[model samples]
Target: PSGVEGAAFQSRLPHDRMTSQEAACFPDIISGPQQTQKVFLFIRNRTLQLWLDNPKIQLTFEATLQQLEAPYNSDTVLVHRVHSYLERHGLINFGIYKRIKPLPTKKTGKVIIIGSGVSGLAAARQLQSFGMDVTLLEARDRVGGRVATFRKGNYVADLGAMVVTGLGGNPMAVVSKQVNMELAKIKQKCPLYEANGQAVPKEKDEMVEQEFNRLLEATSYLSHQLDFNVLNNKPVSLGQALEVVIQLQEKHVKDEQIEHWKKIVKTQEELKELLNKMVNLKEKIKELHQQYKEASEVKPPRDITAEFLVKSKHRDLTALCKEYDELAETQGKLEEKLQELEANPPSDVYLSSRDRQILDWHFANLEFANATPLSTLSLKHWDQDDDFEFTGSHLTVRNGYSCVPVALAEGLDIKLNTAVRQVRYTASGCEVIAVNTRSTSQTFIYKCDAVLCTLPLGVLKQQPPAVQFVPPLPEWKTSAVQRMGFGNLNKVVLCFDRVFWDPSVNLFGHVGSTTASRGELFLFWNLYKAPILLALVAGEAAGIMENISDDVIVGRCLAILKGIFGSSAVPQPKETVVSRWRADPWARGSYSYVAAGSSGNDYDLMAQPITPGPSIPGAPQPIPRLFFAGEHTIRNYPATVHGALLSGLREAGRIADQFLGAMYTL
Candidate 1:
């Protein structure tokens, strides 16, 4: 890392060609398209400065391959080359760089943590590290809240999280390693099928993948543009700016008839995607009420005569007219690209059934990764900027996903079935009331310096099983909770005596005439080596399934198997297990989501520690009496176990910092 030579030096050079700025400096050595000229200028300038400066900074080059300034969506080795070249020219030298700061948790006051989910457990662990006593209260009879695992007849399956979600920055991965759990890089492949049980043809499937990729690429394009707008303090919804470009090119394309394009305009689905990506639907609908007044003679905004659209809310057509009116001035080139995409029909862009299954699966992936759908996701924020990288992407502990949490919970004083009923606070401190979930034990109160509420957002959104805050929380916290979205993710797992599907096929989706909107067992994972089939259901469908019986769900899945593999080939499931996460009084839902109209600042507001009571004369003010941690509270990593875990640690660290001396003597 100190010396710049050989492969190390070579590794940092601008690979394919030099950026224009770099080209201007070393035209003889580097040459590349003008597309990367900005990248070149950024690297050339930034590297020189970083080189001349001392205390040397460490750089990260990975899937993103970011430059000093702009970054690209697709992976590129350009930054690597640029770095090595700068080193070769002796522009800079390496030094030990620090990534995370020392999270020294010195002794703090007693901490009361509610719930034994990842966040609560994590908070307890971190507090213990700081030499502070932590009491964790969990409503459930056992630990590993959402990360559930079940077993039957020598077969084991992760009833909750299946994948390790890659390694590096993953703490769960570390725990797994400590227990000698093997991690695997999953092969990213899934076969598409129709509802009637027909598999998508190979050629058509390939086309669908490419087309879907294009859609995401375009979405990313808009996301990047929005990012720029935010950086410039000219923030606007993705929709606000995209429509400007689309409208401008539309009349031109219609006039040009653009050859094979014959037609040019965003399909309803494309528009819907743009709408969802740009602004949240519920948010848009809510905002429209504020923006527009009913004009009986005028067409509704979104221009549909559909009863819901026309009757549901009024719209301000004038506001959009004004937005476009301001926009007609600038943003042309990007607008042209945006327009080209908007004008194209999104219908044929994605085929039916098998392709639909793939799209559905990808949507499922989106929810699992971010805890929200792309439609409501804030791409401008919510990113894995801190996540470290590793080769093997994901894994399922053959024993169960619960191993990570179970290990983390070891040696901890966690109270099973002790649910917090109320938290009442005064100027001095907070008191948490509790009762046994089954009432076998008497209700008790825990008086502590502070209470750390790591309750899931879903539970917080609804009224108590035990969620009543004295004085009803500040307006900011309550509103933030309201602004956040909670989604349902439930699983259907069936253990069969014999495997009915192809062993080579790790994942499967359902298409066909019978498939419902977005929530079928569109995705299936075969752990049939243990002789089990797992079906993933999400969104509204997961909620619907939570209400149904196990036999019914099994019947539907088995029926689909009968249809796909043939009626005779499929066998009755030896055992059936359906996740009732939504039905769980404590869980309510799986994770948090970004709601419409929210730019995603609510996560910070949600996590803002509460300081109760008034300060007294001559008495030292105590640390925050209320603290928050959960996947939802960690905006960037919300809807993730890692986020939940880290949130807990952060809260503990904050408390530690409050009471601990600047210098830890003890």
Candidate 2:
């Protein structure tokens, strides 16, 4: 009776005629074992829902724990224990994924690492693991290169790169793990804003959560699309794909949801296109509504029905209705699915979603993916030609970021702090006269197996050698070097006595008036709780800022902050720091970038190894024993710390292969 309560009640006599006994039994009939079963099912669903709602379940547990203030090893152990406990209790499934295969190792010869930055460190570490001895040379006294963090009283400010971009799998992750450095997440507070020139008193936590989820979803979609085989075949450009998506949405979405979906697509170009399409569609809709109103107000009111309109105008609205119906259906389905997903989320959804988004974004924006079919028809055509062979590996001891000099130093033994005076390379190995910076009075005459001069392109051009080469370098190489230019950059650091602006804002007020050019000095305040703001200037703008006094720069910056958040909001800073890399004689510029039309072949020439030729009878000829390694030598990782180190490792590996024969093993 309870199972068939609804039907049984209807079949019985009217409710008014039912006996008291029958009425009492009816309540039990509706609330018996079946009712209990329904309650139990609801409870089970609710428990799962709660688990899904919890962010701790979805976040990268290992990464989150690493970012905490606690010691890394202890936090890791705690995370593992929690994971094990969860699995044992059947709360969640852990270790469900397959293990990844290790990367293959290749043997490289004796390597010389030029820089001491992250890139140089990675290359050195990689080559050393492969049984290569790497000697890292650094022009500067210290290591870490652009990853430098300077201490001002109690606070530490990063003068170079502050954040690791979320798109690519950070290579630093693997390196940090290997070195046992505790990686911590730098937590950022949510931003608050006044909308429509009025403060919205309601907390934006829910909105932030929704935005974060949408970003994850969109990024995942982009990443996956990017990882496709479009690099081998002709595919739609990111712009084109975005346009198609927007058009599909416009045809399908309601006014309210259109803006929501637009927020999901993060690419700058895609966002602009969506806004343009929406504006156009709104105008069209407005015109259509006006026409319908006018038609209805005709002398004899026109019929609103499509059938009447079709007979009068000799036109069919059937196709239009069908398109609208299709769009509506699609939109409804998407909305329903989104709701379901939100209500019953998966445990590993965050990481899974993020990874997919990054992959899709990269694939969508890749130049190769957007190329024409004829241009990328065959993968074989894109493969490296047989003209090049795998050479030995090298390492930059200082770091990979500074390895440009070492790459050029291949087959050459270089002396640090040794200033060159005159170089004469006769029929014999080149004879070089150099004055040691450490010793002012004495001039040393060193004979090399061969001289392969690898100096900064600018420095070489600025001071053309009066001494001649026995066999001069090709005109093309000289021309390439002369044409290449480097840009000067400066890092300005300011420390405050107290935190003034909300860290949630993440960006500091710009002090353009202080500089000759507008927005020349851009400042980014401490993203977290730290009381520091860092400013970066480059090119001609950097030149202007560099000439200004520190006190003037600080006063200007304070004024900008006062404008943004009342005069009382400005912080009194204890210290201000600035780096003059351009003024420093050793590094004329931050790093090198290729000129517009220069080919990869020029970089190869810069990296080419030098060898000894037949010697002259009387004079001691300069030997090809000199080698060069620096950031400019490597083409792939150029301008990065990694490039410099790889260049050094490459040079060192060559020497090791020729002499040591992989005798040492780690």
lDDT of 2 by residue, 286-371 (tens): 56555555554565543467436534332223334444556556555555555554465323222233333322322221211111
Q: Show model 1 residue runs off by greater than 4 Å.
A: 1-108, 223-375, 378-391, 464-466, 512-516, 615-622, 664-666
Q: Global lDDT for candidate 2?
A: 0.42
Model 2: weakest 10-residue lDDT segment is 367-376
Worst 10 residues of 1 by lDDT: 1-10
TM-score of every model versus the real structure: 0.65, 0.44
Q: For residues 375-494, what per-residue lDDT tens digits would candidate 1 score against the true structure?
A: 444444434333333334666666776766676687578989898878977667778988988874789789888788988888888864347898579888888877677877788888
